[PDB]
Amino acid sequence: VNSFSGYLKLTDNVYIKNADIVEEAKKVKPTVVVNAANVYLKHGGGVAGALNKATNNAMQVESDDYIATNGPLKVGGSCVLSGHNLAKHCLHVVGPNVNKGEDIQLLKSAYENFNQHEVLLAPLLSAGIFGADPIHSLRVCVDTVRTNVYLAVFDKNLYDKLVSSFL
């Protein structure tokens, strides 16, 4: 039993809700919140910009030190950093950005990072400003993640379409 509330159960391990991931994290304080990161950990917009804003830019400060030490992530890769006031940890995961021409096949690799954590609060990878089809992202999530994932979909209209079209 966990404290995630109001989710629709899609499969044995995948759950979904129309919610703002920032407000969900602040309520649940999960062990792991997933950020829709880029390889430079520049949290300017989308989910990343919203999470970073909620940390009063502490996420960005920590991220800049991470990059200065380690260099950029790989597309499809991840790193674990602090969750600041939102969660114990933040798993920064880089899905491909279609608006940069990046290979969509890397979306499966991106979701594989979730399997290193027993329970996660997450967005749909490569959705929103990353330019991929959120329906496809949900399919890859369900077919790749084996640990317990709670998906927050900000747009109410998109959520209803994801639910209604889910096979």
Ligand X SMILES: CCC(CC)(CO)Nc1ncnc2[nH]ccc12
Q: Which parts of this chain interact with ligand X (CB under 6 A)?
A: 20-22, 46-47, 50, 123-124, 127-128, 134, 152-155
User: Closer CB to ligand X, residue 21 or residue 68?
Assistant: 21
**Nearest CB to ligand X, comparing residues 53 and 65:** 53
Q: How far is the CB of 153 from ligand X (least distance, A)?
A: 5
Q: Region of 130 please: left (phi>0), alpha (psi -120 to 50) or beta.
A: alpha
Q: Least CB distance from residue 22 to ligand X, whole Å?
A: 5
Residue closest to ligand X when measured from CB atoms:
154
CB of 20 to ligand X, least distance (A): 5
Nearer to ligand X, 73 or 121 (CB): 121
Residue with smaller CB distance to ligand X, 96 or 134? 134
